Design a protein around this nucleic acid. Structure first.
Lengths: 175, 114, 215, 122
RNA sequence: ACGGGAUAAGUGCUGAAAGCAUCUAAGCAUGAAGCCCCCCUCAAGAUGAGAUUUCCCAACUUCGGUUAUAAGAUCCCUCAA
RNA sequence: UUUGGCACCUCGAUGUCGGCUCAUCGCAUCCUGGGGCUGUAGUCGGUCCCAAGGGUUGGGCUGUUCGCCCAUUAAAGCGGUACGCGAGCUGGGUUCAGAACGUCGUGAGACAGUUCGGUCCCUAUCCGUCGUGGGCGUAGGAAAUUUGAGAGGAGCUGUCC
């Protein structure tokens, strides 16, 4: 519950406008609205901003940090790209690429197929450098942190969906 | 009809070429065993027990000893899956059905001609 | 979609394809006419109303019911029609497709479809409970006095009473059934019956209301 | 109608002569059976000599019940007794000079082996 | 049989207290022969008494009260799905 | 839900262990189901959690409570309800009067140490549950078809490809 060293939340050329309780990421790359909060009154003087902390209640000061870090995620991702690099391995059962999709010869009854995503760039450099470029942590950081769990690296062989900063471990392989 | 309506339909599916007889007879029956390979025919030979009321329900039964082993076959009388039939012979019977011969073997199971 | 009415007459068997024997039921649907066309804001629910079989017309000293009555005719004549004898409704089907005054035909269906029949049980009478329900009885020897009747009726003095939902004996009777997922076999249009795989509720010359199944 | 506690004949040359049944396997609660099925049983009369001797537990397979059957033909096959035949957890029997008639409804049973081993098949 | 949901168990994911972080204190999804909808039957005595269509209408006559009366019912009678 | 202790209700009677037939609620789950987790690569074994919706053999051997066994099964659960239910069934058993044995008792007799045998009443008045009708009413009357407030029922599996 220790998060408050950074509470700045400065905007960029992307414009943090309002739509009521809603708040709109606009500008060079934007047009994505989302409600910051109710009490957390946000304000931008010319190009700097920071979440007002009214009364610093438990709820209010947690909402300060929500809106701060989430608008930071916005001005990070909708402006630059919430870009997360990862790799892939699927071995023996014919886990094969299909460009913007995939197939596995898991070789069940029926080998079973896989697909790509929407509004997020799945930029493949060499079929194992996949950049996932989106807009924020809550949902697309959830994408980056769930693609690893989609088919994660099973330890005793090591096939699955890895980050650039991930590894494979092993198991006491005793039936 | 209110009453002939069924036969009015099913005379369609009915079959016609087949002969006439009465049980108490000695018969051969060419039958279209459709295995997984082909529609191979064979003949059963037997002795007619019975047959009952008309239509598709007209349906009959024969007896035959395999290996000292009494065996029975009992068939729709209008199926397509017969090739053909022959009255190999006949016999002077007095029943309409022949169940007192489901037990007996040999000269016990003796039969008269026509 | 595609409901229809009739009455049942008989069971039979058929050598269909493959020399395959198939037991079947014959269904004389006939003069199946529309008699109203309900609606969602007129009559509250977009739906239709249908009659099956015409009958004798208005007369006098109608001591029985082969004839009709004043409003019977007054409803039969909204559209151009005759004295029906059996009338129902349908909510499943599309109606704007249809048109009042039609006489929807047995040919509406084809052989090789899925259907959920609806009819009635025959009904039998007042029955013991091993009949009315699948209860297996008690001894008939080794000196017994518990042959067909049931035994227990509930719990002990605690709950000094007898719960509802018992399966006591009672009246075994005709009642509603919705058979499901059945087969269409051949669609006559001269005598206009249908043949359907297997059996259905009800006795001979009873009644049936069929429609397209789904699942 | 076949049930356990029932006296079944054999028609092979393994060393058994007559058996009766313990079980009718299949599913939890399964009672009865007919041609095309696998059972366990025990021998109340063994053939002198032979492999399989009296008072012994055995598996076996059905043939030619008197509760004969009816097929998708719409037609019927019956007999005037019943019989079983004894196997080796492989669809492979012990006695190999099978007597008497047998049905055709056990090709599906994958005793085609046994059918080739058999006399006339029906 | 499911198919949906909301769900569990859970499982993957950003925040300020308690100046990092992180699988409900807001997500996301998820998923149980759990729930709910899924389906089948009974159901306007559902004393609230629903809804539609048709038909009736006392001539007298507060059309009351009358004989009547009509839509309509039943009495009776031949039967059984 | 053990063995007990207290002696309140009941001795002008609340009258029987078992089993049969029926049930019916729980969960502290046996199967299935899911997840996680291990001295689990999956399985394994095991573990933790979610889980009660349902389902949960048949014979042999003891009145015996009981357990043991033979074959299956996905399993072959634990409990609660006057040790679930006898104005629904049997009574095997125990308790009746006979008799026998062993032990003890001077003996009458007792034990329990056993054994054979030995009589289970009720025309349902109320509530209650299964159904069946009658009455009446639903601001006009009659026929037919209807929406459904809700209520009930339904969901087990395993196998081959």
């Amino acid at each position: 519950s220790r998060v408050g060293k950074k509470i700045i939340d400065i905007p960029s050329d992307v414009t943090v406008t309002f739509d009521g309780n809603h708040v709109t990421v606009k500008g060079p790359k934007g047009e994505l609205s989302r409600t910051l909060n109710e009490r957390m009154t946000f304000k931008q003087e010319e190009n700097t901003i920071e979440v007002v902390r009214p009364s610093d209640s438990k709820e209010d000061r947690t909402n300060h940090g929500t809106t701060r870090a989430l608008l930071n995620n916005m001005v990070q991702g909708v402006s630059q790209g919430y870009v997360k690099v990862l790799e892939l391995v699927g071995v023996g059962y014919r886990a094969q690429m299909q460009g913007k999709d995939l197939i596995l010869n898991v070789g069940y009854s029926h080998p079973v197929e896989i697909k790509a995503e929407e509004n997020i760039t799945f930029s493949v450099e060499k079929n194992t450098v996949v950049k996932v470029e989106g807009i924020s942590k809550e949902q697309v950081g959830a994408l980056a942190s769930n693609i690893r769990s989609v088919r994660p690296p099973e330890p005793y062989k090591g096939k699955g969906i890895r980050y650039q900063g991930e590894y494979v471990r092993r198991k006491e392989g005793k039936t | 009809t209110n009453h002939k309506l069924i036969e009015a339909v099913t005379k369609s599916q009915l079959r016609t070429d087949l002969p006439s007889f009465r049980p108490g007879d000695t018969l051969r029956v060419h039958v279209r065993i459709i295995e997984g390979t082909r529609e191979r025919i064979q003949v059963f030979e037997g002795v007619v027990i019975k047959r009952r009321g008309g239509g598709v329900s007209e349906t009959f039964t024969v007896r035959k000893i395999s290996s000292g082993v009494g065996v029975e076959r009992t068939f729709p009388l209008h199926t397509p899956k017969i090739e053909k039939i022959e009255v190999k012979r006949r016999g002077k019977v007095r029943r309409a059905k022949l169940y007192y011969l489901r037990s007996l073997r040999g000269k016990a199971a003796r039969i008269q001609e026509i | 979609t595609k409901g229809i009415l009739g009455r049942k007459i008989g069971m039979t068997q058929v050598f269909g394809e493959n020399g395959e024997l198939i037991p079947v039921t014959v269904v004389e649907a006939k003069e199946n006419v529309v008699l109203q066309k309900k609606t969602v804001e007129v009559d509250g629910y977009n739906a239709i109303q249908v009659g099956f079989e015409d009958k004798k017309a208005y007369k006098k000293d109608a001591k029985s019911n082969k004839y009709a009555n004043k409003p019977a005719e007054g409803h039969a004549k909204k559209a151009d029609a005759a004295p029906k004898r059996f009338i129902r409704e349908f909510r499943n089907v599309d109606v704007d497709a249809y048109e009042v005054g039609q006489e929807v035909s047995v040919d509406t269906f084809v052989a090789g479809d899925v259907i959920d029949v609806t009819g009635v049980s025959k009904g039998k009478g007042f029955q013991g409970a091993i009949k009315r329900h699948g209860q297996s009885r008690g001894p008939m020897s080794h000196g017994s006095h518990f042959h067909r009747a049931p035994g227990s009726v509930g719990m002990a003095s605690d709950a000094s009473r007898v719960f509802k939902g018992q399966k006591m004996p009672g009246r075994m009777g005709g009642n509603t059934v919705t058979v499901q997922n059945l087969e269409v076999v051949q669609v006559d249009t001269e005598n206009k019956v249908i043949l359907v795989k297997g059996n259905v509720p009800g006795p001979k010359k009873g009644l049936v209301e069929i429609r397209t199944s789904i699942k | 109608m076949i049930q356990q506690e029932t006296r079944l004949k054999v028609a092979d040359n393994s060393g058994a002569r007559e058996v009766l049944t313990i079980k009718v396997l299949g599913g939890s609660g399964r009672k009865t059976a007919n041609i095309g099925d696998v059972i366990v049983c025990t021998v109340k009369n063994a053939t002198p000599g032979g492999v399989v001797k009296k008072g012994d537990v055995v598996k076996a397979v059905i043939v030619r019940t008197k509760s004969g059957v009816r097929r998708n033909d719409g037609s019927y096959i019956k007999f005037d007794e019943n019989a079983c035949v004894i196997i080796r957890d492989d669809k492979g029997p012990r006695g190999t000079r099978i007597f008497g008639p047998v049905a055709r409804e056990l090709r599906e049973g994958n005793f085609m082996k046994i059918v080739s081993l058999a006399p006339e098949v029906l």
